[PDB]
Design an enzyme around this catalytic site. Structure first.
Site, PDB file in Angstrom:
ATOM      1  N   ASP A  62     -10.684 -24.099 -49.999  1.00  0.00           N
ATOM      2  CA  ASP A  62     -11.762 -23.382 -49.324  1.00  0.00           C
ATOM      3  C   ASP A  62     -12.458 -22.411 -50.266  1.00  0.00           C
ATOM      4  O   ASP A  62     -11.946 -21.312 -50.504  1.00  0.00           O
ATOM      5  CB  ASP A  62     -11.193 -22.638 -48.106  1.00  0.00           C
ATOM      6  CG  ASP A  62     -12.232 -21.798 -47.362  1.00  0.00           C
ATOM      7  OD1 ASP A  62     -13.460 -22.003 -47.536  1.00  0.00           O
ATOM      8  OD2 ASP A  62     -11.805 -20.933 -46.563  1.00  0.00           O
TER       9      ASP A  62
ATOM     10  N   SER B  65     -30.981 -21.415 -53.658  1.00  0.00           N
ATOM     11  CA  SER B  65     -31.660 -22.693 -53.714  1.00  0.00           C
ATOM     12  C   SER B  65     -33.154 -22.457 -53.882  1.00  0.00           C
ATOM     13  O   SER B  65     -33.699 -21.478 -53.355  1.00  0.00           O
ATOM     14  CB  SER B  65     -31.376 -23.506 -52.443  1.00  0.00           C
ATOM     15  OG  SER B  65     -32.109 -24.719 -52.443  1.00  0.00           O
TER      16      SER B  65
HETATM   17  C1  LIG Z   1     -11.896 -23.110 -43.899  1.00  0.00           C
HETATM   18  C2  LIG Z   1     -11.513 -23.100 -42.450  1.00  0.00           C
HETATM   19  C3  LIG Z   1     -11.285 -21.914 -41.766  1.00  0.00           C
HETATM   20  C4  LIG Z   1     -10.916 -21.955 -40.437  1.00  0.00           C
HETATM   21  C5  LIG Z   1     -10.765 -23.173 -39.787  1.00  0.00           C
HETATM   22  C6  LIG Z   1     -11.037 -24.325 -40.551  1.00  0.00           C
HETATM   23  N1  LIG Z   1     -11.397 -24.297 -41.847  1.00  0.00           N
HETATM   24  N2  LIG Z   1     -10.877 -25.593 -39.842  1.00  0.00           N
HETATM   25  C7  LIG Z   1      -9.926 -26.472 -40.503  1.00  0.00           C
HETATM   26  C8  LIG Z   1     -12.129 -26.212 -39.354  1.00  0.00           C
HETATM   27  C9  LIG Z   1     -13.277 -26.330 -40.344  1.00  0.00           C
HETATM   28  O1  LIG Z   1     -14.420 -26.913 -39.729  1.00  0.00           O
HETATM   29  C10 LIG Z   1     -12.613 -25.480 -38.095  1.00  0.00           C
HETATM   30  C11 LIG Z   1     -11.598 -24.893 -37.112  1.00  0.00           C
HETATM   31  N3  LIG Z   1     -11.377 -23.393 -37.393  1.00  0.00           N
HETATM   32  C12 LIG Z   1     -10.267 -23.135 -38.367  1.00  0.00           C
END
Ligand SMILES: Cc1ccc2c(n1)N(C)[C@H](CO)CCNC2
Length: 330
Positions: free
Chosen positions: A35, A199
């Site tokens: 991330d 951008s």
């Molecule tokens: C980077 C991150 C933070 C929080 C979350 C996340 N990813 N997940 C896996 C997805 C991403 O669309 C959304 C659900 N919220 C938890």
């Protein structure tokens, strides 16, 4: 040193990407969500509230001979979508695709919010933003990249996300076979702790290019492309029947539509997102309304170049003393 790991979509929509990560001795392999929009490496663990674990692989520090409690340290994070997690901290050995960091802070979740629990394919997050955002208290910790940086052949990592296919995260080198043409580099601001850049503009389909500065962040942890309402309205205006739905929470379009491409500017260069990349499928099973991959950033406070944009490019995260971002077509 270098590292190279394959990253794999968690489902048929590319909602997220997981990358295998070795933690501890003997190695415990967890599939983490890399991330670039956060700076905490945290994992489901033997400490996570039992009711909040549903299928994830957990880290068990007691089974790792190199695990050491980071005494007194806690962490607590909430993400842009309202999700959250918190817990305490170990240091341990962490390896990504052959690249090893000793004494990495591994944040052990005691609590995770429902969207993490419901995501059985994601065992944790590995943050790749700047360490200034790390939430460990009272002693802030460094990211995996920050810790590896001095040992790397070059102080860089690259993101090469696939469309409905696996991709690659490389550390310490640029694979010149992985992209076409040249890499265009652009300035980064670290003032908010993100890979923040500007951008040079956009185009919809075969339309003329609009030169306009769009400040935003390169975020591998965000699924969609979030842009100013003006830009997003201009895009969806080219799709018959497309509309913003408050009940669904964004732009939807008839599943029978053929979506136009979307081009964004990187300096004088152009990255083209094919229309299919912008299709995130039926809003609910069997529906003929589909969810759009380009959405308004109006309610966020920041523009986010998420996976929809990034997967159309080979992206260099250059962590030299003056960081920059590079984009190439592929
Ligand atoms: C980077 C991150 C933070 C929080 C979350 C996340 N990813 N997940 C896996 C997805 C991403 O669309 C959304 C659900 N919220 C938890």
């Amino acid at each position: 040193s270098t590292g190279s790991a394959t990253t794999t979509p968690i489902d048929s929509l590319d909602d997220a990407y997981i990358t295998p990560v070795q933690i501890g001795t003997p190695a415990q392999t967890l599939n983490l969500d890399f991330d670039t929009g956060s700076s905490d490496l945290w994992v489901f663990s033997s400490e996570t509230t039992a009711s909040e674990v549903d299928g994830q692989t957990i880290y068990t520090p007691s089974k790792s001979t190199t695990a050491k409690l980071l005494s007194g340290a806690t962490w607590s994070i909430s993400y842009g979508d309202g999700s959250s997690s918190s817990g305490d901290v170990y240091t341990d050995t962490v390896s990504v695709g052959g690249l090893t960091v000793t004494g990495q802070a591994v944040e052990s979740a005691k609590k995770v919010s429902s969207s993490f629990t419901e995501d059985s394919t994601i065992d944790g997050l590995l943050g790749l933003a700047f360490s200034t955002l790390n939430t460990v208290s009272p002693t802030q910790q460094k990211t995996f990249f920050d810790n590896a940086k001095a040992s790397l052949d070059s102080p860089v990592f690259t993101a090469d996300l696939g469309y409905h296919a696996p991709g690659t995260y490389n550390f310490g080198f640029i694979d010149t076979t992985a992209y076409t043409g040249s890499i265009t580099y652009t300035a980064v601001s670290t003032k908010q702790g993100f890979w923040e850049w500007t951008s040079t503009g956009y185009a919809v389909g075969s339309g003329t290019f609009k030169s306009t500065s769009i400040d935003g962040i390169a975020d591998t942890g965000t699924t969609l492309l979030y842009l100013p309402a003006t830009v997003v309205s201009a895009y969806w205006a080219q799709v018959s029947g497309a509309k913003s739905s408050s009940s669904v929470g964004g732009y939807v379009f008839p599943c029978s539509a053929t979506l136009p491409s979307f081009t964004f500017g990187v300096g004088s260069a152009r990255i083209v997102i094919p229309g299919d990349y912008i299709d995130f499928g039926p809003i609910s099973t069997g529906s003929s309304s589909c969810f759009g991959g380009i959405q308004s950033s109006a309610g966020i406070g920041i523009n986010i170049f998420g996976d929809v944009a990034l997967k159309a490019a080979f992206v260099v995260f250059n962590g030299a003393t003056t960081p920059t971002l590079g984009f190439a077509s592929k």
